[PDB]
Amino acid sequence: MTKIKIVTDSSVTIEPELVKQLDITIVPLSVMIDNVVYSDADLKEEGKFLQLMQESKNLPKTSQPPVGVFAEIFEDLCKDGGQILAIHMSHALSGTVEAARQGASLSTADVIVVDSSFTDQALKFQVVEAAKLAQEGKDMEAILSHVEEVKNHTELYIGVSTLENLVKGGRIGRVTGLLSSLLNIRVVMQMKDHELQPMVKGRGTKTFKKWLDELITSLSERAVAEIGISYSGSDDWAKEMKESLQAYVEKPISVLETGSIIQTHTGENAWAILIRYHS
Numbered sequence: 001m002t003k004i005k006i007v008t009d010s011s012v013t014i015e016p017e018l019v020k021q022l023d024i025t026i027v028p029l030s031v032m033i034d035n036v037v038y039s040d041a042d043l044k045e046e047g048k049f050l051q052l053m054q055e056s057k058n059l060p061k062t063s064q065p066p067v068g069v070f071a072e073i074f075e076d077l078c079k080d081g082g083q084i085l086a087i088h089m090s091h092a093l094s095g096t097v098e099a100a101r102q103g104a105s106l107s108t109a110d111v112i113v114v115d116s117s118f119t120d121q122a123l124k125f126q127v128v129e130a131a132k133l134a135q136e137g138k139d140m141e142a143i144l145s146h147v148e149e150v151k152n153h154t155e156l157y158i159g160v161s162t163l164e165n166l167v168k169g170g171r172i173g174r175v176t177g178l179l180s181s182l183l184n185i186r187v188v189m190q191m192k193d194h195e196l197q198p199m200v201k202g203r204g205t206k207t208f209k210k211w212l213d214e215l216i217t218s219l220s221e222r223a224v225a226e227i228g229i230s231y232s233g234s235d236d237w238a239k240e241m242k243e244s245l246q247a248y249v250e251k252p253i254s255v256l257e258t259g260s261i262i263q264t265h266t267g268e269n270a271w272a273i274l275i276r277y278h279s
């Protein structure tokens with residue numbers, strides 16, 4: 001029989017070489033910059049979108065992939081007779097996973113669609129694990145259950161230096177219980193069960209450092225499988241966090257610029273820590 005094929009979306013943050021090595025298909029979102037629509041696939045060069053967003057007259061606007069695009073990719077991918085497992089960013093952030101469900105129903109292909117409950121490198125954990133097992137010839141039930149195990153041992157922490165992109169883009173509606181009379185302020189949230197939960201907020205330049213010290217304390221008694229760090233803007237703070245965190249995980253930490261889809265909604269000088277604990 002034909003190996004299962006893994007699909008995800010371009011909100012995933014992943015080393016490009018791993019996409020090829022694992023035969024992962026990435027369905028691109030799009031972003032409109034000063035009324036010109038770019039495919040996210042053309043916005044992967046380091047720092048390119050950051051510069052565009054710094055200079056554009058308008059805040060960019062992100063768009064999910066069309067239903068019909070998923071239908072056509074699913075139809076092409078199944079020509080080998082194999083099943084498809086599509087793992088996507090949370091429905092709370094984007095309609096992408098729902099467009100995939102609809103594309104699956106329109107296709108003649110045998111398509112399973114899974115909401116990762118995250119995005120960025122936390123979505124990467126599930127997609128990579130799925131594709132590794134797919135490559136080994138595992139069946140759909142075995143892959144789904146291992147992906148779920150990964151999801152359920154994953155945590156996502158995100159810091160932003162302004163609220164304005166979250167407000168304008170709308171995903172502030174997913175932040176539970178945040179009260180700020182200021183947009184320009186530092187906030188650290190945990191994405192848990194499709195909600196952004198504020199852990200702390202503050203104007204000061206030490207708001208992230210003190211939170212980091214608390215995270216590190218909490219890691220003393222945890223077995224950690226993988227940590228990834230993502231950022232928008234410069235990588236200075238991300239590299240600093242890596243220096244403190246690398247001691248807590250054997251696997252080398254991936255420090256990656258987040259994609260245009262995320263940058264549009266977080267703003268510059270944002271960061272994420274994506275942790276996967278041992279199952």
Ligand SMILES: CCCCCC/C=C\CCCCCCCCCC(=O)O
Pocket residue numbers: 029062063064093094095096119120156158171191230231232258261262265266270271272
């Ligand atoms: C700096 C890296 C941040 C990684 C974690 C990001 C998680 C939550 C923050 C909110 C992100 C919202 C993304 C919205 C994408 C919407 C795409 C669409 O138009 O459907």
